DNA sequence: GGTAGACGCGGACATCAAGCCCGCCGTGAAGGTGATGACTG
């Protein structure tokens, strides 16, 4: 099981990336809490903040600024006529934002 | 207020050297989201 170093580089990499965030006036709880909950509570943050998002292929955020709606998640079908192809006959190398 | 019926050929067209430097190019506004935090009727 040599695939936990990704969890190490996700936890300690972000914890060491907070080295420029240095405030010598009021960091006396922020630095300690960041070092504590940046590793152990990071799974809790990635569980509670894993349910705000979704995979998409028909997003509506790119058509209005704050249009809170429902985005599609499935590819369109095949068009039954000859001579016009688009966002359904695209390849299997797709990427869901 | 007259038709009439025609307009040429040949030949040739310059070479040389050169084309700048210096400084500079503006600022302001154009982020949504939960998550408590304060208010609360």
Curated annotation (Swiss-Prot):
Q: Where is this region: Disordered?
A: 66-87
Please give the knockout or disruption phenotype noted for this protein: Mutants lose phage DMS3 infection-dependent inhibition of biofilm formation while there is normal biofilm formation in the absence of phage infection. Decreased production of crRNA in the presence or absence of phage. Disruption of the entire Y.pestis-subtype CRISPR region disrupts crRNA production but does not alter phage resistance (possibly OLNs PA14_33350 to PA14_33310, and the flanking CRISPR loci), indicating this CRISPR is not involved in phage resistance.
Extra remark beyond the main annotation: In this bacteria, Y.pestis-subtype CRISPRs do not confer resistance to phage DMS3 or MP22, but instead are required for DMS3 infection-dependent inhibition of biofilm formation and possibly motility.
**Family to which this protein belongs:** Belongs to the CRISPR-associated Csy1 family.
How does this chain assemble?
Interacts directly with Csy2; part of the Csy ribonucleoprotein complex with a probable stoichiometry of Csy1(1),Csy2(1),Csy3(6),Cas6/Csy4(1)-crRNA(1). A Csy3(6),Cas6/Csy4(1)-crRNA(1) subcomplex is also formed.
Q: Describe the task this protein carries out.
A: CRISPR (clustered regularly interspaced short palindromic repeat) is an adaptive immune system that provides protection against mobile genetic elements (viruses, transposable elements and conjugative plasmids). CRISPR clusters contain sequences complementary to antecedent mobile elements and target invading nucleic acids. CRISPR clusters are transcribed and processed into CRISPR RNA (crRNA). Cas3 and Cascade participate in CRISPR interference, the third stage of CRISPR immunity (Potential). Involved in crRNA production or stability.
In Swiss-Prot or TrEMBL terms, this protein is called: CRISPR-associated protein Csy1
- Organism name: Pseudomonas aeruginosa (strain UCBPP-PA14)
- The record's gene field reads csy1
């Amino acid at each position: 099981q040599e695939l936990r170093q990704f969890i190490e580089s996700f936890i300690q990499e972000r914890l060491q990336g907070k080295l420029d965030k240095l405030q010598p006036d009021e960091d006396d709880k922020r630095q300690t809490l960041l070092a504590t909950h940046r590793r152990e509570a990071w799974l809790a943050d990635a569980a509670r903040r894993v349910g705000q998002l979704q995979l998409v292929t028909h997003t509506l955020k790119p058509i209005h600024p704050d249009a809170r709606g429902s985005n599609l998640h499935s590819l369109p079908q095949a068009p039954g006529q000859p001579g016009l192809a688009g966002s359904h006959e695209l390849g299997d190398r797709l990427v869901s934002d």
